[PDB]
C-alpha cells in the first residue's frame, strides 16, 4: 505494501518496485513507468531493465530511466520529468528507493508554478513521502 500512492491527477509514486508489484500495477492500469533511481544503489536492487521485463507483462507500455540523486537534482531534471509526464500515456508511476526523488521532481515544478511550499509538502505526504527536510530548496524554486 500500500505504498503505490497518488501524487497528482495522472501520477502515482512508489518506493522501489519488485516483481511482486506486477499485480497491483496491472490493477491500477499503469501505462508508463519512470525510474528515478540509478541502478546498483543496493545489492538487492533490481536493475531498471529487469523491472521493465517484469512489468511489460503488466500492461505498461512506456518506460523511462531518469536516474537522479536527491542531492544533485537540477533544473534540467525537473523539466525532463515534467516533459516525460506530459508526453506519457496515463497513468504514470514514478519510483525511486522511497519515492522521495519523484516527489521532489514533481514538487520543484509545482514551486515554480506558484504552489505554496506547505501545500507541496502536504501533497507529497499524502502520497507517503515526507519532504520536510527539503523545505528550503523547495522555497528557492518558487
Ligand atoms: Cl543508472
Commentary on this structure:
The protein is α/β, with parallel strands linked by helices and about 140 residues long. The chain has a single domain (about 1-140), classed as Protein-Tyrosine Phosphatase, Chain A (Alpha-Beta Complex), CATH 3.90.190.10. About 40% of the residues lie in helices and about 15% in strands. It contains 6 helices and 5 strands; from the N terminus they run E-E-H-E-H-E-H-E-H-H-H. The protein has helices spanning about 20-30, 50-55, 75-85, 100-110, 115-125, 135-140; strands at about 5-10, 10-15, 30-35, 60-65, 90-95. Strands 1-2-5-3-4 form a 5-stranded mixed β-sheet. Helix 3 packs across helix 4 (about 100-110) and helix 4 (about 100-110) packs antiparallel against helix 5 (about 115-125). The longest helix has 13 residues, at about 100-110. The protein is globular and about 40 Å long. The N and C termini lie far apart (about 35 Å). The chain binds chloride ion. Chloride ion binds near residues 38, 39 and 67. The PDB classes it as hydrolase. Keywords: Structural genomics, Joint Center for Structural Genomics, jcsg, Protein Structure Initiative, PSI-2, hydrolase. It forms a monomeric assembly. Crystal structure of a putative phosphatase (nma1982) from neisseria meningitidis z2491 at 1.41 A resolution. The protein is hypothetical protein. The organism is Neisseria meningitidis Z2491.
